[PDB]
From a paper:
Two types of crystals of RG13 were grown in the presence of high zinc concentration (2.5 mM). These crystals belonged to space groups P1 and C2 and were refined to 2.30 and 2.29Å resolution, respectively. Superpositioning of the RG13 molecule from the C2 space group onto each of two molecules in the P1 space group yields r.m.s.d.’s of 1.7 Å (619 residues) and 1.6 Å (615 residues) for molecules A and B, respectively. The orientation between RG13’s TEM-1 and MBP domains in the C2 space group is somewhat different compared to that in the P1 space group. When superimposing the TEM-1 domains of the RG13 structures, the MBP domain orientation between the two different space group structures is different by about 8.5°: the MBP domain appears to pivot across the TEM-1 surface with MBP residues furthest from the TEM-1 domain shifted more compared to the MBP residues closest to the TEM-1 domain likely a consequence of the bridging Zn2+ and linkers restrictions. The two connecting loops between TEM-1 and MBP could only be resolved in the P1 space group (in both monomers) although these loops, not unexpectedly, have higher temperature factors than most of the rest of the protein; part of these linker regions comprising residues 317–327 and 583–584 are not included in the C2 space group structure due to lack of electron density. Similarly, there are two zinc ions present in the C2 space group structure of RG13. The Zn2+ ions bound to the three different RG13 monomers can be grouped in two different classes: the main Zn2+ ion, which bridges the TEM-1 and MBP domains, and the non-interdomain bridging Zn2+ ion. The main Zn2+ ion in the C2 RG13 structure bridges the TEM-1 and MBP domains via residues H468 (H112, TEM-1 residue numbering shown in italics and brackets from here on forward), residue E477 (E121), and both oxygens of residue D164 (MBP residue). The (other) non inter-domain bridging Zn2+ ion makes liganding interactions with residues H509 (H153) and H514 (H158) of the TEM-1 domain (in C2 space group).
A successful example of this approach is the allosteric protein RG13 which is a molecular switch created by recombining the nonhomologous genes encoding MBP and TEM-1 β-lactamase and subjecting the resulting library to evolutionary pressure. As a consequence, the RG13 gene confers a maltose-dependent ampicillin resistance to E. coli cells. Intriguingly, RG13 activity was serendipitously found to be negatively regulated by Zn2+ at low µM concentrations in a non-competitive and reversible mode, a characteristic that neither parent protein MBP nor TEM-1 possesses. The structure reveals that the TEM-1 and MBP domains are in close proximity to each other connected via two linkers and a bridging Zn2+ ion.
Author numbering: 1 to 316, 328 to 582, 585 to 637
C-alpha cells in the first residue's frame, strides 16, 4: 500500500508546501530519498479513510485537534524523541499532542488569533474591549470604523466569549471530560452579550464574515481586525502600516483564543517511521528548516525555541514581591520567595532583576538547587535596585532551605499575601463553610485602586473562585478586600496563620493601605523563610484537600506565567495570545461544539434568540 523506501507528505494548500519541499530537497541530497509533497482536497477528512485501509501518506500536517480523532482509531504512530530534543520545543506544545501519556505528533507551529491594528489610523490600540464602542464613535466621524472581524464563525468570536470564564470542554488530570461544557456559564453569556450589544449599537454588522473583514482592513477602512498569521501576507501585500498585539481584555481578563498546534503526525501503517522521524527532528525542526517554510508562507510562531526567539524580534501595579511554585507541569517541587524594596527602582527594573534570578534558577535546575551563581544574581539584584532584597529557594518535599538571603528580616508582603488569603478561603471550603461558586455583590464605593476585574463586575457580582483568581493572577485589590471580608478580616487571616504555626506573618491593613511600605513598619510583613514554610504547609500534608491544593497551585501558576520570573528564561504577539488562550480540545465531540456555538452566535446576533436561551440551547446540544 505505502511505498517502501521513500517519504510522502500531506500538508494543506494554505501552508508553505513549497518551503517544506526545499527541506525535502535538503533531505534528498543527504540521504538519496524522493520526498514527495502533496496537497489534496480535504486531507484531514481523507486521512481517516486511507489510513484505516493500511494506506495513506507517511507524514500528515494538521492542527492537533483532529489528531486526537486519529489516535482513538489507531491511525497515528507513537513518537519517541529524546529530552535532548524535547527541550528544544516549548513544554505546552507537547501537551497538545498527548493522548494517554503517549506522543502522537511532532509540534511544528502555533496558531492563535491576535489583535491587528492599522498604525496610521490608530497608533495606540485599546487595552480593553470596553473602550471599543467609544473609539468606534470617534472613527465613524472620519468615515472609518474601529474593528471588523469574522462574526460568523465561533473560532473568531470565541476569544471574547471565553474571556470571562467560557470553555469548550473541561480538562482535568489529562482527559477531557465530555460532560463538562462551559458555553452556558455567566462568563460566556456576558461575553456574547457584549458582542450582541456591539451589533445592536451598530459598531459591528451581523453580516461581516472572513472576506468582508479582510477586505475592510486591507483597504484601510477599519482601524482593527482579528486574525492569525495565515492573513499576514495579504496585509503585507496591501502595504497597510500594521502592528500585531495582545487581544483586548474583557472584564479585566484576557481574551481567550483557541490555540492550534500545527503538528506532523506519522501514519501507524507507515513502514518508514524511523525515516520520517529523522526528517522531522534533524531537518525540519531546525532553524534552517522552519526558515524555508516561514518564507514560503509565514507560520506565525513556532514550536522550536531557538527560532521563536528570532521571530519574536519582528517589529510587526506589577510585583515588588513574588512567590512561585516551580517544576509545575508535574507536581511542583520548589518554592521561591523574593522581595524587593525601596522607592528608587522602577517596575521595569524590578521585573528585569526578578527575571534574571529566574533565568539563573532554570539554568541550574536539577543540579540540586542553591547554585552559587543564583546567590550572585540575588546579591546583584539588591545592588542594582539600591535597596534590600529578600530571597529563599525551598524544596517543597523536604522543607530544606536550598538558598537564602535575608531569610529572617521582615519585608512588606504586599501582593504575596493574596495566596495566603485564598489558602484560608479554600480551608473554609474544605470544611463546608464556603462555596467557590458563591456570588458576592458589591457597590462602587468598595472599589479601590488597581481593580481591573472587580471594577467591571459591579452589576454582575463575582464568585469566590473568580475573586481568588482576580486577586492572585490579576492582583485585583478590591477582590482581596472582598475575600478578606468573607473570612473576617486581617486579624482572622493572621489568626489562621498563627494556628498553622506561622507566628511571624501578619496582616494588619486592607487594600490599598497595606501596600505603602514605610521603612521598618512591621505591619503587613513576613520573613522570606516564614512565607516559604507557610506556602509549603499549604501545598503539602493534609492542611488542604487534594482538590483545594491543586486549585491553589493552578491560581499561582497563572500568576507566575503572567509575572516577571519566567520572562527572560522562556520568552511574540501570537505566542502571548496563545499563552493566555485555550488549548483546543482534541476530541470528535468538538464537532458538536462547533455546530451548536455557531448557531448560538448567529441567533443571538440576529435577535432570533436572546443571549441566555441561545447559549442554553448550545449547551444542551453538546452534552446530548
Ligand atoms: Zn465574571
Ligand atoms: Zn502566634
Amino acid at each position: 500500500k505505502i511505498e517502501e523506501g521513500k517519504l510522502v507528505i500531506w500538508i494543506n494548500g494554505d501552508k508553505g508546501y513549497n518551503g517544506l519541499a526545499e527541506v525535502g530537497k535538503k533531505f534528498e541530497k543527504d540521504t538519496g530519498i524522493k520526498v514527495t509533497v502533496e496537497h489534496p482536497d480535504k486531507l484531514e477528512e481523507k486521512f481517516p479513510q486511507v489510513a484505516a485501509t493500511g494506506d495513506g501518506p507517511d507524514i500528515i500536517f494538521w492542527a492537533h485537534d483532529r489528531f486526537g480523532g486519529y489516535a482513538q482509531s489507531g491511525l497515528l504512530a507513537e513518537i519517541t524523541p529524546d529530552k535532548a530534543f524535547q527541550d528544544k520545543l516549548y513544554p505546552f506544545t507537547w501537551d497538545a499532542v498527548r493522548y494517554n501519556g503517549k506522543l502522537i505528533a511532532y509540534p511544528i507551529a502555533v496558531e492563535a488569533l491576535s489583535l491587528i491594528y492599522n498604525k496610521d489610523l490608530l497608533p495606540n490600540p485599546p487595552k480593553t474591549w470596553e473602550e471599543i464602542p467609544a473609539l468606534d464613535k470617534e472613527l465613524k466621524a472620519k468615515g472609518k470604523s474601529a474593528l471588523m472581524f469574522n462574526l460568523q464563525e465561533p473560532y473568531f468570536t470565541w476569544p471574547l466569549i471565553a474571556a470571562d470564564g467560557g470553555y469548550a470542554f473541561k480538562y482535568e488530570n489529562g482527559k477531557y471530560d465530555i460532560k463538562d461544557v462551559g458555553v452556558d456559564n455567566a462568563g460566556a453569556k456576558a461575553g456574547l452579550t457584549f458582542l450582541v450589544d456591539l451589533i445592536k449599537n451598530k459598531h459591528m454588522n451581523a453580516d461581516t464574515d472572513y472576506s468582508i473583514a479582510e477586505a475592510a482592513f486591507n483597504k484601510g477602512e477599519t482601524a482593527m481586525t482579528i486574525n492569525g498569521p495565515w492573513a499576514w501576507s495579504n496585509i503585507d501585500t496591501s502595504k497597510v502600516n500594521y502592528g500585531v498585539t495582545v487581544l483586548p481584555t474583557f472584564k479585566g481578563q484576557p481574551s481567550k483564543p483557541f490555540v492550534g498546534v500545527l503538528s506532523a503526525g506519522i501514519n501507524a501503517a507507515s513502514p518508514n517511521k524511523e525515516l520520517a522521524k529523522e526528517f522531522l527532528e534533524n531537518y525540519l525542526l531546525t532553524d534552517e528548516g522552519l526558515e524555508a517554510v516561514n518564507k514560503d508562507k509565514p507560520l506565525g510562531a513556532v514550536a522550536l525555541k531557538s527560532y521563536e526567539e528570532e521571530l519574536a524580534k519582528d517589529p510587526r501595579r506589577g510585583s515588588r514581591g513574588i512567590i512561585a511554585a516551580l517544576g509545575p507541569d508535574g507536581k511542583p517541587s520548589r518554592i521561591v520567595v523574593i522581595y524587593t524594596t525601596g522607592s528608587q527602582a522602577t517596575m521595569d527594573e524590578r521585573n528585569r532583576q526578578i527575571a534574571e534570578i529566574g533565568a539563573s534558577l532554570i539554568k541550574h535546575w536539577g543540579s540540586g538547587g542553591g547554585h552559587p551563581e543564583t546567590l550572585v544574581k540575588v546579591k546583584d539584584a539588591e545592588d542594582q535596585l539600591g535597596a534590600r532584597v529578600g530571597y529563599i529557594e525551598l524544596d517543597l518535599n523536604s522543607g530544606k532551605i536550598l538558598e537564602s538571603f535575608r531569610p529572617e528580616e521582615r519585608f512588606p508582603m504586599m501582593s504575596t499575601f493574596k495566596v495566603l488569603l485564598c489558602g484560608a478561603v479554600l480551608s473554609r471550603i474544605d470544611a463546608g463553610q464556603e462555596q467557590l461558586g458563591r456570588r458576592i455583590h458589591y457597590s462602587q464605593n468598595d472599589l479601590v485602586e488597581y481593580s481591573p476585574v472587580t471594577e467591571k463586575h459591579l452589576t454582575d457580582g463575582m464568585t469566590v473562585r473568580e475573586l481568588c483568581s482576580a486577586a492572585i493572577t490579576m492582583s485585583d485589590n478590591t477582590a482581596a478586600n472582598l475575600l478578606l471580608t468573607t473570612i473576617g478580616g486581617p486579624k482572622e487571616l493572621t489568626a489562621f496563620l498563627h494556628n498553622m504555626g506561622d507566628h511571624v506573618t501578619r496582616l494588619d491593613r486592607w487594600e490599598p493601605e497595606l501596600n505603602e511600605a514605610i521603612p521598618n513598619d512591621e505591619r503587613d510583613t513576613t520573613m522570606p523563610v516564614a512565607m516559604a514554610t507557610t506556602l509549603r504547609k499549604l501545598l503539602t500534608g493534609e492542611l488542604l484537600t487534594l482538590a483545594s491544593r491543586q486549585q491553589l497551585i493552578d491560581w499561582m501558576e497563572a500568576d507566575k506565567v503572567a509575572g516577571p520570573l519566567l520572562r527572560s528564561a522562556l520568552p511574540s504577539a501570537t505566542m502571548e495570545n496563545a499563552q493566555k488562550g485555550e488549548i483546543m480540545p482534541n476530541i470528535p465531540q468538538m464537532s458538536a461544539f462547533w455546530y451548536a456555538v455557531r448557531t448560538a452566535v448567529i441567533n443571538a446576533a440576529s435577535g432570533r434568540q436572546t443571549v441566555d436561551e441561545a447559549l442554553k440551547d448550545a449547551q444542551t446540544r453538546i452534552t446530548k
